[PDB]
């Protein structure tokens, strides 16, 4: 009864792996991170501003 139902679709299925929010999860080739968390890991991922 204390289990969360199994969802493959919708926001409740997708969660950011770092922060844990249920909101903005960019999935370009499988990142699983929130949109703002993406900035605190930008330069470790190899990304560079141009």
């Amino acid at each position: 009864y204390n289990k969360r139902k199994p969802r493959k679709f919708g926001k409740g299925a997708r969660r950011c792996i770092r922060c844990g929010q249920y909101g903005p999860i960019i999935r370009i080739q499988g990142l699983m991170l929130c949109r703002h968390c993406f900035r605190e890991v930008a330069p470790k991922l190899g990304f560079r501003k141009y």
């Binding site: 949109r35 993406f38 930008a42 190899g46 560079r48 501003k49």
Partner: protein, 102 residues
């Protein structure tokens, strides 16, 4: 006749050129016809994100780009030549895929 198609891919251009030079030197020192490194279309992964951490503020956005570059090396089949591409010192970021074509 048989050819080996070697696809090298990396982010830093210098590592890719290093491995290309090593492959070219090895192919010429082994005396094997090699089709020179053909620089394939670099893939440009572009991501846009709003810089505002909240719903307050002017709408400012930032675009970040990965330029992942790739090269193609078509060499002729030679076992003595194929024994000297597994011993090459490969930088970590460089990925090499070596297939065979009739």
């Amino acid at each position: 006749m048989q050819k080996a198609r070697i696809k090298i891919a990396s982010t830093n251009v210098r590592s890719l050129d290093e491995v290309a030079n090593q492959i070219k030197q090895i192919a010429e020192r082994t005396g094997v016809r090699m089709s020179g490194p053909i620089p394939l279309p670099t893939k440009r992964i572009r991501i846009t994100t709003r810089k505002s951490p909240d719903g307050e503020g002017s709408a400012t956005f930032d675009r970040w780009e990965l330029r992942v570059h790739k090269r193609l090396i078509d060499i002729e089949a030679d076992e003595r030549a194929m024994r000297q591409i597994m011993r090459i010192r490969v930088p970590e970021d460089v990925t090499i895929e070596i297939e065979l074509i009739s």
